[PDB]
Design a binder for this molecule. Structure first.
Ligand SMILES: NC(=O)C1=CN([C@@H]2O[C@H](COP(=O)(O)OP(=O)(O)OC[C@H]3O[C@@H](n4cnc5c(N)ncnc54)[C@H](OP(=O)(O)O)[C@@H]3O)[C@@H](O)[C@H]2O)C=CC1
Ligand SMILES: O=C(O)COc1cc(F)ccc1C(=S)NCc1ccc(Br)cc1F
Length: 316
């Protein structure tokens, strides 16, 4: 398959990237170095993951080593919820740039559509455990993102975890200057997201699938939850193709015209997960994988569910 997708800002985005949530700071530098050595050209990062400095050490080493040129890398980060304030967005972006050792990002996303009270805590709580919101809405935060493009800090802007109506809000913004380039959402065979994906694709937004393996290392996993990697129906499709279950799970979103960002810190798996450009799932395989949808989410959070902009009340 073609390895990059054209964005609505005119840049090309690699369809396979390396995820970094939960990658320990003492392991992620090596993970990113190995990833770049074996061909990855897209890294998915975020301030809230608390490891951007260590990601940046890897990136800088590979640039210094002339393993890859900066123009060939596609580096993504995300604005955390406590920085949805007009006067805080630029500084948040600049902190991420400083940590990653970069002078621009290829793509900067609004991490979640919910703003939280600014401060040191990533999840400021009231005395009863509810997150404390910000009064600032997704449209004013979007205008702040647009300024980053115009100041040269980021090449593209986008959104993450926005539902159908929140995407529409952005597209219908009075005076919209730049459309979102990407909506990054959870997507895998048990949460197939057909409705949201068709909406975004019909509007020219590229969708990035996160947690494509079902995030088995999520901190709130329960021993009894469904497991994609262990699903014998998926194992059977993999065996037919002489591939691993992970490779099928990565190829699946690629054939839906999605970008996909599997996470690993294991060098052998980092390599395995990149070897997904030499086989094709049939249409029947694709439809079969889609049939496994159960509307099951890795990423949700009870403490945030009353926030007026919490995204997963809406059907899609
Ligand atoms: N925008 C948002 O709100 C969110 C963005 N994301 C992004 O998406 C990325 C991917 O999602 P994530 O939730 O991390 O989970 P993934 O679905 O990518 O699963 C990661 C887990 O799968 C394991 N794994 C990786 N490759 C294989 C393999 N070949 N065989 C077996 N196990 C494997 C990893 O183990 P190990 O590392 O030990 O090898 C790790 O435990 C995140 O890291 C982050 O960058 C994720 C959630 C939310
Ligand atoms: O968020 C990620 O990328 C991966 O997950 C996380 C990654 C982190 F580094 C810290 C917390 C999260 C959580 S708990 N995320 C879920 C979540 C956060 C905020 C809101 Br609004 C709803 C929600 F569901």
């Amino acid at each position: 398959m073609a390895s990059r997708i054209l964005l609505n800002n005119g840049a090309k985005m690699p369809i396979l990237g390396l995820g970094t949530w939960k990658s320990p700071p003492g392991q992620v530098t090596e993970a990113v170095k190995v990833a770049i050595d074996v061909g990855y050209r897209h890294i998915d990062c975020a301030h809230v993951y608390q490891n951007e400095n260590e990601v940046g050490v890897a990136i800088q080493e590979k640039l210094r080593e002339q393993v890859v040129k900066r123009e060939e890398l596609f580096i993504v980060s995300k604005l955390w919820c406590t920085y949805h304030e007009k006067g805080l967005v630029k500084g948040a972006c600049q902190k991420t740039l400083s940590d990653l050792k970069l002078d621009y990002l290829d793509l900067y996303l609004i991490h979640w559509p919910t703003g939280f009270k600014p401060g040191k805590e990533f999840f400021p709580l009231d005395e009863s455990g509810n997150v404390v919101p910000s009064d600032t809405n997704i449209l004013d935060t979007w205008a702040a993102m647009e300024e980053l493009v115009d100041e040269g800090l980021v090449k593209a802007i986008g959104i993450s975890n926005f539902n159908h109506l929140q995407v529409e809000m952005i597209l219908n913004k009075p005076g919209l200057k730049y459309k979102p380039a990407v909506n990054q959402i959870e997507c895998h065979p048990y949460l197939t997201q057909e409705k949201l994906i068709q909406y975004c694709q019909s509007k020219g937004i590229v969708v990035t699938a996160y947690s494509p393996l079902g995030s088995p290392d999520r901190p709130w996993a329960k021993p009894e939850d469904p497991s994609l990697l262990e699903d014998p129906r998926i194992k059977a499709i993999a065996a037919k193709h002489n591939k691993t279950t992970a490779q099928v799970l990565i190829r699946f979103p690629m054939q839906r015209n999605l970008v996909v960002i599997p996470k690993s810190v294991t060098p052998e798996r980092i390599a395995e997960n990149f070897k997904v450009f030499d086989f094709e799932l049939s249409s029947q395989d694709m439809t079969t994988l889609l049939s496994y949808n159960r509307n099951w989410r890795v990423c949700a959070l009870l403490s945030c569910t009353s926030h007026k902009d919490y995204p997963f009340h809406e059907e899609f």
